[PDB]
Design an enzyme around this catalytic site. Sequence first.
Site, mmCIF file in Angstrom:
data_model
loop_
_atom_site.group_PDB
_atom_site.id
_atom_site.type_symbol
_atom_site.label_atom_id
_atom_site.label_comp_id
_atom_site.label_asym_id
_atom_site.label_seq_id
_atom_site.Cartn_x
_atom_site.Cartn_y
_atom_site.Cartn_z
ATOM 1 N N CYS A 65 0.806 -1.225 0.000
ATOM 2 C CA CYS A 65 0.000 0.000 0.000
ATOM 3 C C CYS A 65 0.838 1.274 0.000
ATOM 4 O O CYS A 65 1.606 1.534 0.946
ATOM 5 C CB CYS A 65 -0.968 0.019 1.203
ATOM 6 S SG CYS A 65 -2.011 1.489 1.255
ATOM 7 N N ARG A 106 -0.044 4.648 2.819
ATOM 8 C CA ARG A 106 0.028 4.429 4.269
ATOM 9 C C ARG A 106 0.386 5.645 5.128
ATOM 10 O O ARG A 106 0.341 5.557 6.355
ATOM 11 C CB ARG A 106 0.971 3.264 4.610
ATOM 12 C CG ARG A 106 0.399 1.877 4.356
ATOM 13 C CD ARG A 106 1.445 0.818 4.647
ATOM 14 N NE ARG A 106 2.409 0.709 3.547
ATOM 15 C CZ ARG A 106 3.563 0.061 3.635
ATOM 16 N NH1 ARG A 106 3.899 -0.516 4.778
ATOM 17 N NH2 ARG A 106 4.389 0.000 2.586
ATOM 18 N N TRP A 156 -9.184 6.182 -0.774
ATOM 19 C CA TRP A 156 -9.542 6.900 -1.996
ATOM 20 C C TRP A 156 -8.565 6.510 -3.095
ATOM 21 O O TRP A 156 -7.456 6.028 -2.817
ATOM 22 C CB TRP A 156 -9.557 8.423 -1.795
ATOM 23 C CG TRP A 156 -8.325 8.973 -1.160
ATOM 24 C CD1 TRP A 156 -7.115 9.212 -1.768
ATOM 25 C CD2 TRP A 156 -8.176 9.377 0.206
ATOM 26 N NE1 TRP A 156 -6.227 9.727 -0.853
ATOM 27 C CE2 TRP A 156 -6.851 9.843 0.363
ATOM 28 C CE3 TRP A 156 -9.039 9.395 1.315
ATOM 29 C CZ2 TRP A 156 -6.364 10.314 1.586
ATOM 30 C CZ3 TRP A 156 -8.557 9.866 2.529
ATOM 31 C CH2 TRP A 156 -7.232 10.320 2.655
ATOM 32 N N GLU A 187 -4.791 3.715 -10.958
ATOM 33 C CA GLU A 187 -5.560 2.503 -10.732
ATOM 34 C C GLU A 187 -6.675 2.395 -11.769
ATOM 35 O O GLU A 187 -6.884 1.336 -12.368
ATOM 36 C CB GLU A 187 -6.165 2.504 -9.332
ATOM 37 C CG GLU A 187 -5.159 2.391 -8.206
ATOM 38 C CD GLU A 187 -5.858 2.361 -6.846
ATOM 39 O OE1 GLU A 187 -6.410 1.286 -6.498
ATOM 40 O OE2 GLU A 187 -5.881 3.406 -6.145
HETATM 41 C C1 HEM Z 1 -6.609 6.537 1.889
HETATM 42 C C2 HEM Z 1 -5.931 6.500 0.735
HETATM 43 C C3 HEM Z 1 -5.341 5.194 0.137
HETATM 44 C C4 HEM Z 1 -4.606 5.170 -0.977
HETATM 45 C C5 HEM Z 1 -4.223 6.394 -1.847
HETATM 46 C C6 HEM Z 1 -4.226 3.799 -1.233
HETATM 47 C C7 HEM Z 1 -3.480 3.359 -2.297
HETATM 48 C C8 HEM Z 1 -3.333 2.035 -2.651
HETATM 49 C C9 HEM Z 1 -3.010 1.516 -3.971
HETATM 50 C C10 HEM Z 1 -2.781 2.355 -5.252
HETATM 51 C C11 HEM Z 1 -2.948 0.182 -3.868
HETATM 52 C C12 HEM Z 1 -2.671 -0.827 -4.993
HETATM 53 C C13 HEM Z 1 -4.053 -1.366 -5.376
HETATM 54 C C14 HEM Z 1 -3.969 -2.231 -6.602
HETATM 55 O O1 HEM Z 1 -3.043 -1.999 -7.428
HETATM 56 O O2 HEM Z 1 -4.826 -3.147 -6.750
HETATM 57 C C15 HEM Z 1 -3.231 -0.191 -2.494
HETATM 58 C C16 HEM Z 1 -3.247 -1.477 -1.994
HETATM 59 C C17 HEM Z 1 -3.575 -1.866 -0.714
HETATM 60 N N1 HEM Z 1 -4.052 -1.052 0.312
HETATM 61 FE FE1 HEM Z 1 -4.027 1.035 0.188
HETATM 62 N N2 HEM Z 1 -4.745 2.990 -0.235
HETATM 63 C C18 HEM Z 1 -5.440 3.817 0.632
HETATM 64 C C19 HEM Z 1 -6.119 3.353 1.747
HETATM 65 C C20 HEM Z 1 -6.010 2.104 2.334
HETATM 66 C C21 HEM Z 1 -6.679 1.695 3.556
HETATM 67 C C22 HEM Z 1 -7.647 2.624 4.338
HETATM 68 C C23 HEM Z 1 -6.315 0.423 3.814
HETATM 69 C C24 HEM Z 1 -6.732 -0.487 4.997
HETATM 70 C C25 HEM Z 1 -7.463 -0.082 6.048
HETATM 71 C C26 HEM Z 1 -5.398 -0.008 2.763
HETATM 72 C C27 HEM Z 1 -4.772 -1.244 2.646
HETATM 73 C C28 HEM Z 1 -4.283 -1.791 1.479
HETATM 74 C C29 HEM Z 1 -3.935 -3.182 1.229
HETATM 75 C C30 HEM Z 1 -3.994 -4.415 2.167
HETATM 76 C C31 HEM Z 1 -3.456 -3.211 -0.218
HETATM 77 C C32 HEM Z 1 -2.997 -4.448 -1.011
HETATM 78 C C33 HEM Z 1 -4.315 -4.943 -1.604
HETATM 79 C C34 HEM Z 1 -4.112 -6.202 -2.399
HETATM 80 O O3 HEM Z 1 -3.172 -6.978 -2.062
HETATM 81 O O4 HEM Z 1 -4.900 -6.421 -3.362
HETATM 82 N N3 HEM Z 1 -5.244 1.040 1.878
HETATM 83 N N4 HEM Z 1 -3.457 0.966 -1.781
HETATM 84 C C1 LIG Z 2 -8.255 0.566 0.107
HETATM 85 C C2 LIG Z 2 -7.862 0.790 -1.340
HETATM 86 C C3 LIG Z 2 -7.391 2.030 -1.767
HETATM 87 C C4 LIG Z 2 -7.039 2.210 -3.102
HETATM 88 N N1 LIG Z 2 -6.577 3.407 -3.569
HETATM 89 N N2 LIG Z 2 -7.169 1.182 -3.967
HETATM 90 C C5 LIG Z 2 -7.619 -0.037 -3.592
HETATM 91 C C6 LIG Z 2 -7.766 -1.141 -4.632
HETATM 92 C C7 LIG Z 2 -9.289 -1.270 -4.761
HETATM 93 C C8 LIG Z 2 -9.880 -1.899 -6.013
HETATM 94 C C9 LIG Z 2 -11.145 -1.469 -6.428
HETATM 95 N N3 LIG Z 2 -11.749 -1.970 -7.514
HETATM 96 C C10 LIG Z 2 -11.145 -2.923 -8.234
HETATM 97 C C11 LIG Z 2 -9.885 -3.400 -7.877
HETATM 98 C C12 LIG Z 2 -9.241 -4.478 -8.722
HETATM 99 C C13 LIG Z 2 -8.108 -5.154 -7.961
HETATM 100 C C14 LIG Z 2 -7.715 -6.445 -8.670
HETATM 101 N N4 LIG Z 2 -6.259 -6.621 -8.590
HETATM 102 C C15 LIG Z 2 -5.913 -7.241 -7.305
HETATM 103 C C16 LIG Z 2 -5.815 -7.488 -9.690
HETATM 104 C C17 LIG Z 2 -9.238 -2.890 -6.749
HETATM 105 C C18 LIG Z 2 -7.981 -0.251 -2.263
#
Ligand code: HEM
Ligand SMILES: Cc1cc(N)nc(CCc2cncc(CCCN(C)C)c2)c1
Lengths: 407, 411
Positions: free
Chosen positions: A106, A109, A278, A283
Site C-alpha cells: 500500500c 500508508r 480513496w 488505478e
Molecule cells: C486513503 C488512501 C489510500 C490510498 C491512496 C491507497 C493506495 C493504494 C493503492 C494504489 C494500492 C494498490 C491497489 C492495486 O493496485 O490493486 C493499495 C493497496 C492496498 N491497500 Fe491502500 N490505499 C489507501 C487506503 C487504504 C486503507 C484505508 C487500507 C486499509 C485499512 C489499505 C490497505 C491496502 C492493502 C492491504 C493493499 C494491497 C491490496 C491487495 O493486495 O490487493 N489502503 N493501496
Molecule cells: C483501500 C484501497 C485504496 C485504493 N486506492 N485502492 C484499492 C484497490 C481497490 C480496487 C477497487 N476496484 C477494483 C480493484 C481491482 C483489484 C484487482 N487486482 C488485485 C488485480 C481494486 C484499495
Amino acid sequence: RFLKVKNWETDVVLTDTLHLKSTLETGCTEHICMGSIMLPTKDQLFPLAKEFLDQYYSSIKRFGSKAHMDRLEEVNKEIESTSTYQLKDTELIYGAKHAWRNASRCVGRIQWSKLQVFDARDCTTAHGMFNYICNHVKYATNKGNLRSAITIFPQRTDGKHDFRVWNSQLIRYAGYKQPDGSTLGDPANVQFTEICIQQGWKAPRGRFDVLPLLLQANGNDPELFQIPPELVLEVPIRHPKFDWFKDLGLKWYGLPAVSNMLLEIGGLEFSACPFSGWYMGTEIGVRDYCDNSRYNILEEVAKKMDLDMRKTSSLWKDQALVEINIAVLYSFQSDKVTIVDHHSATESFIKHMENEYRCRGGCPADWVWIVPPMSGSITPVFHQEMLNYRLTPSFEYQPDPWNTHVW
Amino acid sequence: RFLKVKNWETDVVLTDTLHLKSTLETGCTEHICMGSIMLPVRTKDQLFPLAKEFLDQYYSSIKRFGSKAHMDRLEEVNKEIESTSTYQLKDTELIYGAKHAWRNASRCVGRIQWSKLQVFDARDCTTAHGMFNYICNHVKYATNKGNLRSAITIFPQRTDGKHDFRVWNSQLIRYAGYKQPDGSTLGDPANVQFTEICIQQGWKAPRGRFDVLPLLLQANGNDPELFQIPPELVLEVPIRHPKFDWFKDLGLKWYGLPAVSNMLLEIGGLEFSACPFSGWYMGTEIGVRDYCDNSRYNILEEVAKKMDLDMRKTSSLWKDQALVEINIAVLYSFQSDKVTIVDHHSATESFIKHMENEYRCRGGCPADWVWIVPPMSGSITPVFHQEMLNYRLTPSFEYQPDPWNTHVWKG
Ligand code: HEM
Ligand SMILES: Cc1cc(N)nc(CCc2cncc(CCCN(C)C)c2)c1
Ligand code: HEM
Ligand SMILES: Cc1cc(N)nc(CCc2cncc(CCCN(C)C)c2)c1
Ligand SMILES: C[C@H](O)[C@H](O)[C@H]1CNc2nc(N)[nH]c(=O)c2N1
Ligand SMILES: C[C@H](O)[C@H](O)[C@H]1CNc2nc(N)[nH]c(=O)c2N1
Ligand SMILES: [Zn+2]
C-alpha cells in the site's frame, strides 16, 4: 542482520531494524526470489495474543505494567476456558490501524493513523451485514470528500461459521460473455457475475452495472443485496482538451473498497473486514481502462486522437495512456471526488517511509506494487530501495468462498 | 521440485525446473525479500567442482557428455589446477561461457539475442596500450556504421587478485560531468567523480555538456593509463522530434553504443575482471533514465515549458506528457539516422517470447522483474503482467568493487 536501504536519486541511506520482528514467511529463499509472484488451537493462539498485547501495551507506554500483566492474565484464562478471546475496542482499533500500517503493498500508508473503525462484531445476519456496509459506504463516500474506513464483522470461530463478503470489492461492475464472443462490461468479473445470476440476480446486462452484494453470515449460505444506487457515487469521465472523450461513455465509481481480505489481529481472524480509502488515478486510468484483460480502451482512444498506430515506436499507446490518465484525474477533481495522482502519492509515501524508519526502525514495502504502473522512474519510489517483510497485525489473502463453501 | 509462474493478462502458466541448478545466493530469505536492492583469490579446493560443473554443462550442450573427449578434458583441467592452481579455457569453452553469462543475466530484457554474440578473445593482452587497441576494435566492430552488432571483449582472467585487468570506466562511452563551484552541474552528473579521476590522471577536459570521457585502463594490476577513443569511432545521434521543431534546439545528442565495462564475467570458477560487452539501446534507457532522472540530465522542466503544459500542479501530468515526447524523439532520431534501437514495446514483447521459449526448451528463464519492466508505461508492456522467478545461474556477469576504491597505487 541490520539492513540498509539506499535511495539512488538522493543517496539517502536508511537502516532497517524492524524486519527482525517479522514472523510470516515471504515465499523467497536464499536460492530464489519470488518478489514478482502475486500470490505466494490454544497452544498456537496464546503466544500470538501475547505478542500482540505486548506491542499494544508498549504503544501506550504501559509495558510491564500491572494492567499489561492483568490483561495478559485475563486473555490467557479466556483462551484456556473458551478456546478463543475477545479484543477490547481499544485493541481492535489499534490492530486495524496497524494492519494497514503493515500493508507492504500500500502506497497510501501515510494516512494509516486516520482510519475510522466500525465495530460490527455484534452483527448476526446477512441483513445486518448489508446495513453495516451501506453505512460504511455512505460514511466513507461523504459526498465526495472521502474518509478512510473499515468495518469489522465477527471473528472466525470453528471456521464453519465464517462471515464473508463474497465480492472482492464493495463496488465493482458486472461482466457478461456475449454470444458474439466478445465481453460486455468488466471482463475481470464474468465468473462472479455468473454466481450472482445463479443466486437470482436480475442482471441489466449493461457495460457498467454495479454488482449486488453477496453476503455470508455465520457460515450460512450467502444472500444477495443491492447497495442503494444513490449511495454509489460515480464519476463520468471527460477530458479537459478533447471534447470527444465524453462520447466514449466511460465512468467509474468513487469508492475503492477491498472486501475479500482477512484481517489478523492477535492471532484472531476477521474473514469479513471491508476497508476503503480513496483512489490513485493510475488505478483507474492505467489498469481498469488499459489492461488488455480489462476495459482495454487504448486502441479506441488512440484512433480518436488520430495517432499513427502502424508502428510501436510512434509510442501511440504511451500517448493515449497519458491522456486517459489526465481525463480520469480531471473528472474526479471537477466533481470534487477525492483522488490523488501518482506523483503526489509516491512523494507522500517517501515521506512516510522516512517517518517510519525514524520512529519505528523501518517500513515493509513491496516495490513491485508501490511503483505506479506508468511513468515509474519519474516517481521517487522507483529510485528507493525497499525491504519487504510480513508483520502482524496484517491483511492477508484468503480463498474465494465459492471454492470453500458447503452449500 | 516444480515452480509455477502465471501471466495475469493471458492466464498462461509456465513451470520452472531450471531453478534447481541455481547456486549463488539471492539476498532474500524466508523472512525478507531483497528484490528491489540494487547491489545485494580462489582456492583449488573450490575451483575443481566449479570447473567440473561448467565442463559438464559445456559437454552436455554439445551432446558429448561422458565422452572420452569430455573425460580427457576434465582430467586435463584437474591436472592443470593441481599443477598451476588455475586453468585455461579452450576458445570454444570461452565463447560458450560468455554467451551463457548473457543468457543467464536476469536483469537483461534483450536476451532473445543471446546466441548471437561476437566474442573477442583478448587473453593474450599484456599492457594498457594493448587493451586500448582491443577496445577500439570492439567499438568499431560493434558500431558497424550504425548497424549495431553485439560483442564482448575478454581480457586475461584474475590470478592472485594483485594483477587484475580492469576497465575503470563503468561504460566504454559516457559523457563527462563537472561540478561547478555554485553547486550546479555541467554534463552528466552521474559521472562527476570519475571525471575528476580522469582529470587528476591528466585528461584535458573541454568542459562541455557532452564530452566523451577517455578510457582509463589497467593491465596486470599496474596503475591505470588514459587513452582517448578516436572521435571518428564514436557514433553519436543528435536528438530531434518529428513534430516539434524546437526540440533540436535543446542541444541534445547521445552515443549509439551501450557498452558495460565494470562487470566481472565468471566461467567455470575463473574470473574475468575486464570483459566489456555491448548491444544496442532500448529507447527508454536514454529517453527516460539518462534524460529525465532528476540526478541525470533532468530535462523534464525545460521540455514541458516548451510544450506549454500546465506545470502548476502534478495532476495535469505534465511530466508524463513531456516524458512521452522525449522518448518519441530519441526513437525518431536513432531511426532517422539508421542507428539500431528498439522501443520498449518491441523489446518486452520479444522478451516474453524468449522467456516462453526458454521455459519449454531449458526449463526456465531467471528474470528480475524490477529491472525487466521498463521505467515508463510499465503495465502497457506484457512483462508487467508476467510473474518471474529470479535466481542465479553460472556462467554469470557479477558486480565487483570500483577499482579506485581497491587499487594499490604503484606511483
Ligand atoms: C486513503 C488512501 C489510500 C490510498 C491512496 C491507497 C493506495 C493504494 C493503492 C494504489 C494500492 C494498490 C491497489 C492495486 O493496485 O490493486 C493499495 C493497496 C492496498 N491497500 Fe491502500 N490505499 C489507501 C487506503 C487504504 C486503507 C484505508 C487500507 C486499509 C485499512 C489499505 C490497505 C491496502 C492493502 C492491504 C493493499 C494491497 C491490496 C491487495 O493486495 O490487493 N489502503 N493501496
Ligand atoms: C483501500 C484501497 C485504496 C485504493 N486506492 N485502492 C484499492 C484497490 C481497490 C480496487 C477497487 N476496484 C477494483 C480493484 C481491482 C483489484 C484487482 N487486482 C488485485 C488485480 C481494486 C484499495
Ligand atoms: C543486443 C541488444 C541488448 C538489449 C536491447 C539489452 C537491453 C538491456 C537493458 C535495457 C538493460 C538495463 C540497462 C540499465 O537499466 O542500466 C540491460 C542490462 C543488462 N544487460 Fe542487456 N541488452 C542487450 C545486449 C546485451 C549483451 C550483448 C549483454 C552481454 C553479453 C548484456 C548483458 C546485460 C547485463 C549483465 C545487464 C545488467 C547490467 C547491470 O546490472 O548494470 N546485454 N540490457
Ligand atoms: C549491453 C547493454 C545493452 C543495453 N541496451 N544497455 C546497456 C546499459 C548501457 C549503459 C550505457 N551508458 C550508461 C549506462 C548507465 C547505467 C546506470 N545504472 C547501472 C545505474 C548504461 C548495456
Ligand atoms: C506479475 C506482477 O506481480 C503483477 O502484474 C503485479 C505487478 N505490480 C502490481 N502493482 C499493483 N499496485 N497492483 C497490481 O495488481 C500489480 N500487479
Ligand atoms: C531501487 C531500485 O532497485 C532501482 O531504482 C532500480 C529499479 N529498476 C531498474 N531497472 C533498470 N533496468 N535499471 C535500473 O537502474 C533500475 N534501478
Ligand atoms: Zn525476494
